[PDB]
Design an enzyme around this catalytic site. Structure first.
Site, PDB file in Angstrom:
ATOM      1  N   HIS A   1      20.382   9.548  15.210  1.00 21.75           N
ATOM      2  CA  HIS A   1      21.153  10.540  15.955  1.00 21.75           C
ATOM      3  C   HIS A   1      20.268  11.346  16.919  1.00 21.75           C
ATOM      4  O   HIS A   1      20.774  12.064  17.780  1.00 21.75           O
ATOM      5  CB  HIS A   1      22.038  11.414  15.038  1.00 21.75           C
TER       6      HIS A   1
ATOM      7  N   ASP B   1      21.090   6.013   9.582  1.00 17.13           N
ATOM      8  CA  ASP B   1      20.595   6.991  10.545  1.00 17.13           C
ATOM      9  C   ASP B   1      19.065   6.965  10.596  1.00 17.13           C
ATOM     10  O   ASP B   1      18.381   7.829  10.029  1.00 17.13           O
ATOM     11  CB  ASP B   1      21.114   8.384  10.175  1.00 17.13           C
TER      12      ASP B   1
ATOM     13  N   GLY C   1      14.270  21.788   7.949  1.00 20.04           N
ATOM     14  CA  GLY C   1      14.117  20.502   8.604  1.00 20.04           C
ATOM     15  C   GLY C   1      14.719  20.469   9.999  1.00 20.04           C
ATOM     16  O   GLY C   1      15.744  21.102  10.258  1.00 20.04           O
TER      17      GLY C   1
ATOM     18  N   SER D   1      16.559  17.866  12.672  1.00 19.89           N
ATOM     19  CA  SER D   1      17.115  16.520  12.759  1.00 19.89           C
ATOM     20  C   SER D   1      15.966  15.525  12.878  1.00 19.89           C
ATOM     21  O   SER D   1      15.069  15.718  13.693  1.00 19.89           O
ATOM     22  CB  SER D   1      17.974  16.380  14.011  1.00 19.89           C
ATOM     23  N   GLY D   2      15.998  14.463  12.077  1.00 18.38           N
ATOM     24  CA  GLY D   2      14.986  13.428  12.159  1.00 18.38           C
ATOM     25  C   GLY D   2      13.685  13.704  11.428  1.00 18.38           C
ATOM     26  O   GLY D   2      12.820  12.839  11.381  1.00 18.38           O
TER      27      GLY D   2
END
Ligand SMILES: [Ca+2]
Ligand SMILES: [Zn+2]
Length: 221
Positions: A38, A82, A173, A175-176
């Site tokens: 994403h 993902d 966190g 994203s990723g």
């Protein structure tokens, strides 16, 4: 409630920058980063050795991405699969402050403690976050607890980690970003209500399911 990691104490932590910091990632060898599908965008610059993302502090390496490879089965609606690989144009210089993290040999189990790290930027969320790297120690939850937290949404390629009590929110966190357990990259920050609601766990891509694909893809690109 988490804590300030300390500069360069998470040496595999990456910032992805396309004009601004838009996602995290994990350095898995000198020329490859693991992140969330994403997070896919064009014009990625990989930034290693960061602590304050708004200040040049002396240990950074900025390297343009050569290309990104989204998992062939990524579904942007369900977030199943993902995961994305990012190849660097040149090899990073590895030292104590910039270092790769090992891929898992085996999956992790409920109850195992992990380290979630990041600057708290979730893609397209519009949410405020700090500029220095934040950390949270959190346990992996059982499959059943994870599914009970998110009915109808947890696939075999996902797991939950965090706290179902305490009245805290987990927004560390990006994203990723990495979820590292006993020195292995077991998770990627994917989705969840863990930051928006108190007492909810994060949902993470289950990296151990993807090791063959990761190794094969790197070997061929
Ligand atoms: Ca910096
Ligand atoms: Zn941000």
């Amino acid at each position: 409630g988490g804590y300030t990691c300390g500069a360069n104490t998470v040496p595999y932590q990456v910032s992805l920058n396309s004009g601004y910091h838009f996602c995290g990632g994990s350095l898995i060898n000198s020329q490859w980063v693991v992140s969330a599908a994403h997070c896919y965008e064009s014009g990625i610059q990989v930034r290693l050795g960061e602590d304050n993302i708004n200040v040049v502090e002396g240990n950074e390496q900025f390297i343009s991405a050569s290309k990104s490879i989204v998992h062939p089965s990524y579904n942007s609606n369900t977030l199943n699969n993902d995961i994305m690989l990012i190849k660097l144009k040149s090899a990073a210089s590895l030292n104590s402050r910039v270092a790769s993290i090992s891929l898992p040999t085996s999956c992790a189990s409920a109850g195992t403690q992990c380290l979630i790290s990041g600057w708290g930027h979730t893609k397209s969320s519009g949410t405020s976050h700090p500029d220095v790297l934040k950390c949270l120690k959190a346990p992996i939850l059982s499959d059943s607890s994870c599914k009970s937290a998110y009915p109808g949404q947890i696939t075999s390629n996902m797991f939950c980690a965090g706290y179902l009590e305490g009245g805290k929110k987990s927004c560390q966190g990006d994203s990723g970003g990495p979820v590292v357990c006993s020195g292995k990259l077991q998770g990627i920050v994917s989705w969840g209500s863990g930051c928006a609601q108190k007492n909810k766990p994060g949902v993470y891509t289950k990296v151990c399911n993807y090791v063959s694909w990761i190794k094969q893809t790197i070997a061929s690109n």
